[PDB]
Design a protein around this ligand. Structure first.
Ligand code: FES
Ligand code: FES
Lengths: 551, 551
């Protein structure tokens, strides 16, 4: 699809965009500012690289990205190019989890895409090198490269080596009586959104090999930063652009890595948004097809025992992708940011170390199909997402326990946990527009497990859940309750039946009484009327569409 | 008006917001990350200050803001508080002037407001210290403080001392024959948007005294940065919030400083957007009233001879505001970020140095009324803005010469400059939605002057012009041509009459034929369908509304 968003270049030149301001004499004012920032007359002939970091001091996953940004600029200069560093904003989910600040989390991804797109277009930079952290910005930088279609490389900031979930669990164990206060003070990584997206983006071919597996402050991470300029100079010579690297086949390669590694359900939203940014289509059914074709082979947290550094020891992400390619699960002809295809990159990487117990064989997988399950039915007619380990059974049925927010659900389970036994808990009003921002909720699952109701109740929402309750936990239910979807018409006592085999969330209420409720339903007032969250409400699409905001 | 946008605090505490994550035991995961970034147990009791810089390496007006940000964090720590630095994006108009990159300029102001609002809300910071550059971001930081209504101080980065307009003029003089190529290479400050907004925001009371007049890399600028934490600690003790400082009277104080200093017409858009962010109203008529009440007394560029450093020598901005206050033009009871009122701040500042020839007396002003004129009429029924020196006469009439963009106007004046003689030049399709982004255009005025047609033709647009042509130059014409306003119905040969006395832009075409054209008019297709500029088209209001996007 023809994506018209950003300026076009004014053929074998390496400064196709920066020559708009460095070569014409009518742009003498642009050259004077470039002379002011330190560019010589010979510098005006070189390509200009926009170096976009997501550095801020309020998160361990971003506090050291300015160091990486400085090494990237040095590598760009060593490649004979000009480096212009700029920095965008970012928020920490570990800080805001459990508060209204989570309403600002998911929208920051689209804010970051708009930020990099804005600077790259106004300053006429030729290429981009983005450095996101081990938080959840990553897809935002890829979305910006897709809009611009200028050569770019994503440098993952790296995952912090092990010493947040243990610190979040501390309050539950303290209240339950497992640990004391002192043990709680002492407590105060795996395949979550950060490691899922980094590994998927590398499998997508938009990050250099080993980028997703090298730890944060490993000396090799700085070495990767100083080499990004060399690879990007090659991409400018070939004019290998993001829309040449992000194809339906590379999109499937990223989906394969998510299913094989047990990636987060947030990858559904992010990969759909990334696919839309290059004019491609990616539906929930595409995820079910890849899920039913790729087995779970990865004994990593939260589902398993190991973390990302353990992957790094046994050969890193390229060793894992080499194994999947040898099993015929990935398309190796896809071009990458190395100037070569995926198979040419993987042909000369050390295989998984002998005797590794992280990556299971095809003979003995953790699960024969993928963890991601797309569920529809009467209550989620437009789709929903759930993480299924295969060990919880195929069915669950029970009366509905409906809550209009995460807060009222936590006050009920605290005051009467036994009234939750055998129920299908519905936390609605948490979607992209009703939240707003579609917040991620970790406390509902933890409170259910701390009450001893892990396998004795289900959990549905039009928002997002972080962890699993060893039962049935479903999110992304579309249409959301704010939009008048069936999830907004459920009443207490309604018998809800989840069928994993049929991939349906159904209600015993007849479709005629369901339509009777719909005719009487009025939309609740928006929780905000100003600010960035109100613009999100005015712009965001549904969860099944990746919550894109620019369509 | 009740502005509901950002989270509310969970009374005499100084950490009203950060205590949401530092004090509850259910937020143990938030405290672990805070321990990871270096906070001790005693640090969890202190207020948390969000330090938002607009640093990037591609502009002289922002390349040194990281140094200021580091000094601000040191001052915050010296005041016994915690400082969290984060950085947002920003674009340079001097780089993108004359290119399609200017379409991304004005929208970056609203992008910056969304950026700071996002970080402050998710991280639960108690206060803010923003450091914008001598580009045009400044109102964006104030808009974010108004949405949050948490104590905040704006630290102006400072204006660069004199060695861009001379570099932009170089091509015109080279083509005309005034200078050669070598003289042009050698060439490759005043009251423009940066100095206008900084001085207006200081007069508004949201910047410490002398902030707008101290040069960029003056040693006193670092001293101001290290003192912002002390003043903000006082604002937290008084709980003096932006909506206590930004009032209808302080809004008028900023408007008075714009009229007295001959500020840019962009201050109309920015001050309206700032007023909306605190739930207040500010119309174009309010600007005409202040304009007709405050005389132009300021011999500064581009209208005069001197620059901002000359103001700094004769006493800086506080000396100018003290003079206006003594003439009874400003309300001195307005609270400021110093914990005191404007009059208490100005009572003990050195007056204008004896013998200064920059600030004219009330007896001999440069202009008896303000430079800003609000024009309406048949062609701008919803308003328009123009800068009037008072020396160009009251009337202009001529046949219309219509262009659907800046590019087609420059190709015509280059090929046939004499066909412009005596015409009313109309460059339409450059508004907030038709541009898109409402770009600023400097080349139309320069090409008209270089052709010797400065006083022999007029200039109208639904976008923005930067400089004056010594004639009649009008922008912000509402409704814009994309919205089907009368500016989009003008045909070549239409007699347009500008009447400054009546404040009207009228056409000789009867209102019946005007409505005949309107019934046949169809909206042109949007120039983009994806990206941040398409979200701008979906969100932006009219120019008379300040081009706000969150309503
Ligand atoms: S805040 Fe970085 S992974 Fe959650
Ligand atoms: S780019 Fe800074 S004032 Fe224009």
């Amino acid at each position: 699809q023809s994506v018209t968003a950003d300026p076009s270049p004014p053929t074998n030149k390496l400064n196709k965009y920066s020559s708009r301001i460095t070569e014409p004499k009518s742009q003498g004012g642009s050259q004077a500012i470039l002379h002011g920032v330190g560019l010589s007359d010979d510098d005006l002939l070189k390509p200009q690289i926009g170096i976009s970091s997501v550095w801020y001091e309020g998160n361990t996953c971003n506090m050291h990205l300015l160091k990486l940004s400085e090494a990237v600029k040095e590598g760009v200069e060593n490649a004979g190019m000009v480096g212009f560093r700029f920095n965008t904003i970012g928020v920490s989910d570990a800080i805001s989890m459990g508060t209204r600040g989570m309403c600002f989390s998911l929208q920051s991804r689209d804010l970051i895409a708009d930020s990099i797109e804005t600077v790259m277009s106004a300053q006429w930079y030729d290429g981009n090198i983005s450095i996101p952290g081990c938080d959840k910005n990553m897809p935002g930088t890829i979305m910006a490269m897709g809009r611009l279609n200028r050569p770019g490389i994503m440098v993952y900031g790296g995952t912090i080596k092990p010493g947040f979930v243990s610190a979040f669990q501390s309050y539950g164990e303290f209240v339950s009586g497992s640990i004391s206060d002192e043990q709680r003070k002492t407590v105060l990584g795996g395949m979550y959104t950060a490691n899922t997206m980094a590994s998927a983006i590398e499998a997508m071919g938009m990050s250099l090999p080993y980028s997703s597996s090298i730890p944060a402050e490993d000396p090799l991470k700085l070495d990767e930063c100083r080499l990004a300029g060399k690879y990007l100079l090659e991409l400018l010579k070939m004019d290998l652009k993001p829309r040449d690297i992000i194809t339906p086949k590379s999109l499937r390669n990223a989906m394969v890595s998510v299913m094989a590694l047990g990636g987060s359900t947030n990858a559904v939203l992010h990969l759909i948004a990334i696919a839309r940014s290059v004019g491609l289509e990616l539906t929930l059914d595409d995820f079910q097809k890849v899920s039913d074709a790729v087995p779970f082979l990865a004994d990593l947290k939260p589902s398993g025992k190991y973390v990302m550094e353990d992957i790094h020891k046994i050969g890193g992400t390229p060793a894992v992708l080499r194994y999947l390619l040898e099993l015929g699960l990935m398309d190796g002809d896809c071009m990458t940011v190395t100037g070569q295809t995926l198979a040419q990159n993987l042909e000369n990487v050390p295989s998984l170390t002998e005797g590794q117990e992280i990556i299971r064989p095809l003979s003995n997988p953790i699960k024969e199909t993928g963890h991601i399950q797309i569920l529809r039915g009467d209550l989620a007619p437009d789709g929903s997402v759930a993480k299924i380990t295969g060990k919880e059974g195929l069915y669950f049925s029970g009366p509905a326990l409906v809550f209009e927010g995460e807060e009222s659900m936590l006050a009920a389970i605290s005051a009467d946990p036994m009234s939750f036994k055998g129920t299908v808990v519905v936390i609605r009003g948490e979607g992209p527009k009703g939240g707003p921002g579609m917040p991620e909720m970790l406390t509902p699952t933890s409170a259910i497990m701390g009450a001893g109701l892990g396998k004795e109740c289900a959990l549905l929402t039009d928002g997002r859940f972080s962890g699993g309750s060893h039962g049935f936990v479903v999110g992304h239910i579309c249409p959301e309750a704010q939009e008048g979807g069936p999830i907004g018409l459920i009443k207490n006592g309604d018998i809800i039946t989840i069928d994993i085999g049929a991939a349906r969330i159904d209600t015993q209420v007849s479709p005629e009484e369901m339509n009777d409720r719909r005719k009487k339903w009025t939309a609740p007032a928006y929780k905000v009327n100003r600010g960035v969250l109100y613009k999100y409400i005015k712009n965001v699409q549904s969860a099944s569409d990746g919550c894109v905001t620019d369509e």
